């Protein structure tokens, strides 16, 4: 039963697309004509976070938006004082390839993995001596392409082997695993209530899971490519993806579909990172043509351009309380946007 | 007071400078090499006093445009060729017109057929280069075949950008092809190339 | 959703003509490089022919070269290959691929591990 079950399955999709097209009548963009624009929004690299030695390609920023860490495949996580500029840790890495990191709500924690399958979470608290290796979080048969942590307890790491992971840290064991994913995920993100989590993968698909019961409740279709990023709304509702097709999308967990699409005639580069604003109103995606675009959520159209950068822009962070734009690229720089 | 702790940032902001920089020195040193035909493989060897950092990647997934994104900064990549010559070249054709690997030079290494290629008949073997001694003219002009249609791959969409090295099968010719591409980078940087 | 709709198959009889043609959707089909690959039984996939963005760009296995010709309509979102003198070995679930990203030369949809891009494949016997 293979025909038979695939035409069935087909029927299926017909019908979803058929569900969603009866909550379509009308587009995110024509109820957002009546917005007033934003405008041309001008940013300037206040900071430039200079001692990468190789190319930058993950970041994350700390709840207290001081805070950042970054990861380099020098083999360095180098975390970050925004404010003056000073490094505070260099944490030498056993892997030279790393390809995520993640910094722990409290700061207790740095997180970091790659193509060695191992998520190493590193202690920041340093009871007795400097940064240690507190915890080892093998497991996966892929690449760690993208981790966030729920809490000091819990972590969500994305992997090349199709499947995403819960780990409880003090065990270092697996807690659920999200298979449903057919290609290799990219980047994960977690709902600001952590109830939830969207990631992308390379199936042009973006599936929402569930923490808890570690099942699939919504699967989103709507890219032409392989998806490189991913980023919640700040209501927690929806969330904007990145995808080498040159075009950002915004999906909403309660319409199951595409609300607006982000795409431009002279932009046919992929999009690396994708980030909110504060607000929710900017959103800022990493490309590979050297620059990186502000995007309004609403009105669809270009409101600033980065281009500080002179390499692909690979990772990209906006502060929790939205004051200002982290950009990492593989010029081994990091630039503050404000 | 703030100076205090600033001051005390500013040390711990030197200290790290003091150990990134030597960090720095040892990894310039280093050549990375991607070897392709934990999660991967690490065989440290030196020739020449400079050391040479060959990675092979092991439990991955047959879907490799996206991590090997990752190797877009090494010295070189490291090509081995074991019909599977039909898949390998296709897979040399990827590497050599991937977007972010363009920059980086291949060092190709073949091994072990009419049928397979019809041109093969036509083909004839090159002039400018000679047999190893004791080698047969069938298996000369079987190997400069092989050889030849990979470098036509190479040679294509090639702009001097990066290279193509091949070699019938070592490491001194893997020194000697990393230190011809490090030549050729630095006189492309005072645009004698 | 991209999505690749292969039609055309069944039984021909060795050196006759078969056409294969595929409906693609869920994407711009004129600005990706899309390419052929079949799976004969007890072995794995192998990459048979690719066509560029606007056809410029035209290449062939040794094993089918002459024999098979590609071709795609940009107008009604659809590829094109064109069989001919079909060997009995020649026989295998051809599968069309497409290439992950726009506007590059690379290809990567050779893999074994089900590629997302790629159909559901249309079983050819000789």
């Known amino acids: 039963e293979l025909d038979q079950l695939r035409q069935e399955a087909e029927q299926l999709k017909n019908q979803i697309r058929d569900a969603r097209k009866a909550c379509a009548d009308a587009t995110l963009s024509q109820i957002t004509n009546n917005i007033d624009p934003v405008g041309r929004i001008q940013m300037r690299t206040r900071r430039t976070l200079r001692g990468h030695l190789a190319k930058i390609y993950a970041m994350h920023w700390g709840t207290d938006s001081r805070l950042l860490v970054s990861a380099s495949q020098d083999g360095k996580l180098i975390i970050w004082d925004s404010y003056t500029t000073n490094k505070v840790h260099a944490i030498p890495l056993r892997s030279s390839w790393v390809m995520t990191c993640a910094y722990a709500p409290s700061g207790n924690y740095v997180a970091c993995g790659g193509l060695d399958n191992i998520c190493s979470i590193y202690n920041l608290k340093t009871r007795e001596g400097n940064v240690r290796v507190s915890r080892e979080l093998a497991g996966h048969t892929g690449y760690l392409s993208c981790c966030r942590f729920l809490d000091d307890n819990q972590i969500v790491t994305s992997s090349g082997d199709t499947t995403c992971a819960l780990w409880d840290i003090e065990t270092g064991q697996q807690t659920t695993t999200f298979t449903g994913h057919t290609g290799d995920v990219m980047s994960l993100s977690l709902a600001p209530d952590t109830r939830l989590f969207v990631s992308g993968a390379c199936d042009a698909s973006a599936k929402l899971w569930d923490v808890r019961e570690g099942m699939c409740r919504q699967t989103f279709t709507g890219h032409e490519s392989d998806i490189n990023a991913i980023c919640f709304f700040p209501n927690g509702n929806a969330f904007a993806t990145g995808s080498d097709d040159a075009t950002c999308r915004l999906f909403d967990l309660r319409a199951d579909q595409e609300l607006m699409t982000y795409s431009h005639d002279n932009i046919i580069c992929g999009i690396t990172s994708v980030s909110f604003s504060k607000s929710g109103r900017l959103l800022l995606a990493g490309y590979d043509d050297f620059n990186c675009n502000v995007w309004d959520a609403l009105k669809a159209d270009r409101a600033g351009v980065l281009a500080g950068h002179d390499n692909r822009v690979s990772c990209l962070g906006v502060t929790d309380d939205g004051m200002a734009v982290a950009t990492g690229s593989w010029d081994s720089f990091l630039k503050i946007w404000n | 007071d703030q100076r205090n702790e600033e001051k005390a940032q500013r040390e711990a902001n030197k200290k790290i400078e003091k150990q990134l920089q030597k960090d720095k020195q040892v990894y310039r040193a280093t050549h990375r090499l991607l070897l392709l035909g934990s999660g991967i493989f690490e065989t440290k060897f030196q020739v020449d006093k400079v050391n040479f950092h060959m990675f092979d990647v092991g439990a991955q997934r047959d879907e490799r445009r996206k991590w090997i994104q990752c190797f877009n900064d090494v010295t070189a990549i490291i090509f081995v060729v074991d019909n599977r010559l039909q898949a390998a070249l296709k897979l040399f054709d990827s590497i050599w017109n991937n977007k972010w690997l363009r920059d980086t030079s291949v060092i190709l290494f073949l091994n072990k057929i009419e049928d397979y290629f019809p041109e093969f008949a036509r083909y004839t073997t090159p002039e400018d280069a000679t047999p190893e001694p004791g080698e047969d003219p069938r298996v000369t002009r079987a190997k400069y075949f092989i050889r030849d249609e990979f470098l036509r791959i190479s040679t294509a969409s090639g702009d001097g950008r990066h290279y193509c090295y091949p070699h019938f099968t070592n490491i001194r010719r893997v020194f000697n092809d990393c230190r011809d591409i490090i030549q050729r980078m630095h006189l492309r940087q005072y645009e004698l190339l | 959703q991209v999505q690749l709709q292969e039609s055309g198959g069944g039984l021909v009889q060795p050196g006759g003509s078969l056409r294969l043609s595929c409906a693609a959707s869920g994407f711009t089909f004129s600005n990706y490089k899309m390419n052929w690959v079949r799976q004969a039984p007890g072995k794995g996939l192998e990459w048979v022919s690719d066509?560029?963005?606007?056809?410029?760009?035209?290449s062939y296995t040794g094993s089918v070269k002459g024999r098979f010709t590609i071709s795609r309509d940009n107008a009604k979102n659809t590829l094109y290959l064109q069989m001919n003198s079909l060997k009995p070995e020649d026989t295998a679930v051809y599968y069309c691929?497409?290439?992950?990203?726009?506007?590059?030369?690379?290809?990567?949809?050779?893999?074994?591990?089900?590629?997302?891009?790629r159909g559901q494949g249309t079983q050819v016997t000789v």
């Open positions: 691929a497409r290439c992950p990203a726009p506007f590059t030369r690379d290809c990567f949809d050779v893999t074994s591990t089900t590629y997302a891009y």
């Open positions: 066509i560029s963005q606007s056809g410029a760009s035209i």
